[PDB]
Amino acid sequence: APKYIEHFSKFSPSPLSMKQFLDFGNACEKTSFTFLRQELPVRLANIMKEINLLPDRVLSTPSVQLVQSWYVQSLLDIMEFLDKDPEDHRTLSQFTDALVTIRNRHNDVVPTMAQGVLEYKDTYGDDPVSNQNIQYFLDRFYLSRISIRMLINQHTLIFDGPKHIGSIDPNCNVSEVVKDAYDMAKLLCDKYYMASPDLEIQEINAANSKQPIHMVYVPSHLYHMLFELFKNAMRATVESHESSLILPPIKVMVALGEEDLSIKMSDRGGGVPLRKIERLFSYMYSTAPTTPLAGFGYGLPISRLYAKYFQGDLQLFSMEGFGTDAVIYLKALSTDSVERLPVYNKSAWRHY
Amino acid sequence: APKYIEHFSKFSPSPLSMKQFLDFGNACEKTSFTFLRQELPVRLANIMKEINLLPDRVLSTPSVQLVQSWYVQSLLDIMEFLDKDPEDHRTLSQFTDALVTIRNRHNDVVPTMAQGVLEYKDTYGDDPVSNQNIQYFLDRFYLSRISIRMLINQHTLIFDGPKHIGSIDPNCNVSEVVKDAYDMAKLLCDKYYMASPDLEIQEINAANSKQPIHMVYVPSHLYHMLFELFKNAMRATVESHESSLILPPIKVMVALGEEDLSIKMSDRGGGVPLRKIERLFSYMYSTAPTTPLAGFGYGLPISRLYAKYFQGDLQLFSMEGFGTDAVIYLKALSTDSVERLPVYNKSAWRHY
Ligand SMILES: CCNc1cc(F)cc2c1NC(=O)[C@@]2(C)N1CCC[C@@H](Nc2ccc(C(=O)O)c(Cl)c2)C1
Ligand SMILES: CCNc1cc(F)cc2c1NC(=O)[C@@]2(C)N1CCC[C@@H](Nc2ccc(C(=O)O)c(Cl)c2)C1
Ligand SMILES: CC(C)c1ccc(COc2ccc(CC(=O)NCCN)cc2Cl)cc1
Ligand SMILES: CC(C)c1ccc(COc2ccc(CC(=O)NCCN)cc2Cl)cc1
């Protein structure tokens, strides 16, 4: 790898807690600049080195080379600011402009890597070992991308424009986000199917049973996960009940405990056999040539990465012949909500 | 390893479907004898070779050596019949007697390996890498033991004594077994706690909605799994509701689909954080010096092996502050219900 990738890849990424993001709210902007002009090169270089561990028959394909060419240019864009003066307000403005260009440059990274998966499937095959390696790589690659976008969004949202702090809501009303995502999925379901399940929500605030459940979170991530789950639940409910006059509703429970905030969504959409659950989270099995449901795009496994990004999880358990439950597990406390970042080391090197 | 272990370990175990067990019901007894005088040495030798891949600081401990001494004697007991005449009815009688001695000889294998786990925890420590290796080894070791006991039970039950075929019920009414296990857990809960949750059962027979759900299964395995889950659900319900006059009931759904038969048990016993679920399935973290609940003995992870033994699973998902669901996944068809057997090869050798 080039000199500059070698230098920054020997650092490991520095994970931030939701509280640190929040405690960071003038002097703030210079502080963000000097943090990000080091940290973004570290995160970019670490994933670029990991891309380089893919075999030549993957590495040399047009999709991987185009993604590499983007990351290289973004890394160079940022390295221009290493010697610049944080007191000069023109430097801070150019920095923000450059981060916006970088975010736009990477907007197509998800489907671009999909074309690499697709080419591999049809030029080398879709066996379980290939599936495992694609799953290991893309989980880490997409999680790294999520963490880079988070950093950039927090800077450009705060230092271009406070109940919200960039993309973080310190008082995120969870049931309200549930309702929004449900309404939007319903609108798509009503349009395609003239029929959509109703919604039942129940809250369990264990410590304060009469208090509405709020948390510190990134509500756009939470909306995306819920919307993806609602689309699948409604589709399954409509198609499994062609003969009923009744569509069963979708039920959601929001539970707040001492450590977890959990959201369980329940459909009666007929379920799938246990054997197929792993297929639904697999990038490789969900990949085909160009409203993508579970098993036919990356919405579900990327939704799980959003949950894992701050130490949560997203799990599915179905009952074939009846329905399916999904649980989003989130950390309840902002000090436990810490970025989960892949690192390039000899422990990651060995998996390949 | 000795000559005789080397020979039989180069065969791999031959897994049987539930239908094959069943289709095997005089001439049957000679057929069982000549099958088992080869297959039991194969299964015994394969696991003995795998025990020998443990490091010397595990291998040399008194617990592992005692288990090895048992398996060695059982392997020798069986090898006596290799040259004998299946037509001689005295040989068949001695064979059954010898299998009964072997089953009794191994009755204490589970807690004996526990003492080896306990010694290791306190003489070398309880780090995650040690936990992973103990989990990999004991899952395979205990599953192998379950498959050996199954084979022996089918022979001694059929050819010493038909709605039932040995330990298999071709018409196992699942809700009835659920009720039995619930009644027994309730009796223990009523005794310790003067109070026990009631039971609600619902069935969903997707193809034939009015028909009671039956399957081909080993009902003693199913009873054990349910009883273990009910004990935990009741304990959690009693302890989390010290202040309520009401104990919430435990709900069970039995779903029959085209491929899966699924049993979901639901409590409102307050739940646990997601972080602790893995602790509950871990042998190492559940091990302590001599009614063991999840996290304090091997009932739960061994219950999961019973489900996996015929291509099923047992999964837990909790909601901290509310309750916990458990799902037993079984194969609905007797031709899909095939023994899951560990094998000694270079692929198993590498994990160590
Ligand atoms: C409470 C939230 N509910 C759910 C959430 C999910 F993320 C997934 C599902 C849910 N509810 C379902 O029923 C489920 C499982 N489906 C939704 C409709 C599409 C469907 N996809 C399939 C189905 C079958 C196959 C196959 O191999 O035959 C294949 Cl490739 C793909 C998945
Ligand atoms: C529908 C079936 N229900 C359930 C099934 C389970 F197999 C487990 C549970 C269930 N329902 C619970 O609540 C659960 C999770 N408990 C039951 C009571 C005992 C309890 N054990 C513990 C708890 C906390 C810790 C700790 O680290 O603090 C530890 Cl070591 C151990 C587990
Ligand atoms: C396009 C991206 C998402 C993508 C597409 C395809 C792949 C496939 O990656 C594989 C496939 C097989 C093996 C085993 C092997 O034989 N290794 C040989 C090592 N030289 C290793 C890897 Cl990393 C990964 C990532
Ligand atoms: C008693 C039984 C259940 C038991 C108790 C304890 C253990 C612990 O087994 C370990 C622990 C560490 C390592 C890594 C290592 O450093 N390996 C060195 C290889 N020479 C490998 C193994 Cl197989 C297994 C089984």
CSV table of C-alpha atoms in Angstrom, one decimal, chain A residues 202 204 206 253-264 266 268 272-276 311-313 315-322 325 327 329 331, chain B residues 202 204 206 253-264 266 268 272-276 311-313 315-322 325 327 329 331:
chain,number,residue,atom,x,y,z
A,202,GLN,CA,-47.4,-1.3,24.2
A,204,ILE,CA,-43.2,-1.3,29.6
A,206,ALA,CA,-39.9,-1.1,34.3
A,253,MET,CA,-43.7,-3.8,22.5
A,254,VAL,CA,-41.2,-1.2,23.7
A,255,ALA,CA,-39.5,-2.3,27.0
A,256,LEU,CA,-37.1,-0.1,29.0
A,257,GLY,CA,-34.9,-1.9,31.5
A,258,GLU,CA,-31.8,-1.1,33.5
A,259,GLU,CA,-29.4,-1.8,30.6
A,260,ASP,CA,-31.5,-2.6,27.5
A,261,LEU,CA,-34.2,-0.8,25.6
A,262,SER,CA,-35.9,-3.5,23.5
A,263,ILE,CA,-38.4,-3.2,20.7
A,264,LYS,CA,-40.2,-6.4,19.6
A,266,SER,CA,-44.8,-9.3,15.9
A,268,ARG,CA,-49.0,-13.1,12.0
A,272,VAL,CA,-40.8,-19.2,7.5
A,273,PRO,CA,-38.9,-22.4,8.4
A,274,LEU,CA,-35.8,-21.9,10.7
A,275,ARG,CA,-33.6,-23.0,7.8
A,276,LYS,CA,-34.4,-19.9,5.9
A,311,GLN,CA,-23.6,-2.2,20.9
A,312,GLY,CA,-27.2,-3.4,20.1
A,313,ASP,CA,-28.5,-6.2,18.0
A,315,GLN,CA,-32.7,-10.7,15.9
A,316,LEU,CA,-35.4,-12.6,14.1
A,317,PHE,CA,-37.4,-15.7,15.3
A,318,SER,CA,-40.1,-17.1,13.2
A,319,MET,CA,-42.8,-19.8,13.7
A,320,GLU,CA,-43.6,-21.4,10.4
A,321,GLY,CA,-47.3,-21.6,9.9
A,322,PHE,CA,-48.0,-18.7,12.3
A,325,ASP,CA,-41.0,-11.8,15.7
A,327,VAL,CA,-36.4,-7.7,18.3
A,329,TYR,CA,-31.9,-4.5,21.2
A,331,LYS,CA,-28.4,0.1,25.0
B,202,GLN,CA,-52.6,-22.3,21.7
B,204,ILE,CA,-51.7,-23.4,15.0
B,206,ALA,CA,-51.5,-24.4,9.4
B,253,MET,CA,-47.9,-21.7,21.3
B,254,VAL,CA,-47.5,-24.9,19.3
B,255,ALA,CA,-47.2,-24.2,15.5
B,256,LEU,CA,-47.1,-26.9,12.8
B,257,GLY,CA,-45.9,-25.9,9.4
B,258,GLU,CA,-44.7,-27.6,6.3
B,259,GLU,CA,-41.1,-28.1,7.6
B,260,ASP,CA,-41.0,-27.0,11.2
B,261,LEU,CA,-42.9,-27.8,14.3
B,262,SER,CA,-42.3,-24.9,16.7
B,263,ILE,CA,-43.0,-24.5,20.4
B,264,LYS,CA,-42.8,-20.9,21.8
B,266,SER,CA,-43.5,-16.9,26.9
B,268,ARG,CA,-43.5,-12.2,32.0
B,272,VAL,CA,-32.5,-10.2,31.4
B,273,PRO,CA,-30.2,-7.9,29.4
B,274,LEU,CA,-29.1,-9.3,26.0
B,275,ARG,CA,-25.5,-9.4,27.3
B,276,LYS,CA,-26.4,-12.2,29.8
B,311,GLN,CA,-31.8,-31.0,13.3
B,312,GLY,CA,-33.8,-28.7,15.6
B,313,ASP,CA,-32.7,-25.8,17.8
B,315,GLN,CA,-33.4,-20.3,21.1
B,316,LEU,CA,-34.0,-17.6,23.8
B,317,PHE,CA,-34.9,-14.0,23.4
B,318,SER,CA,-35.5,-11.8,26.4
B,319,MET,CA,-36.8,-8.2,26.9
B,320,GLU,CA,-35.3,-6.8,30.0
B,321,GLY,CA,-38.0,-5.2,32.1
B,322,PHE,CA,-40.7,-7.4,30.7
B,325,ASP,CA,-39.5,-16.1,25.1
B,327,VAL,CA,-38.6,-21.4,21.0
B,329,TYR,CA,-37.6,-25.7,16.7
B,331,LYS,CA,-38.4,-30.9,12.2
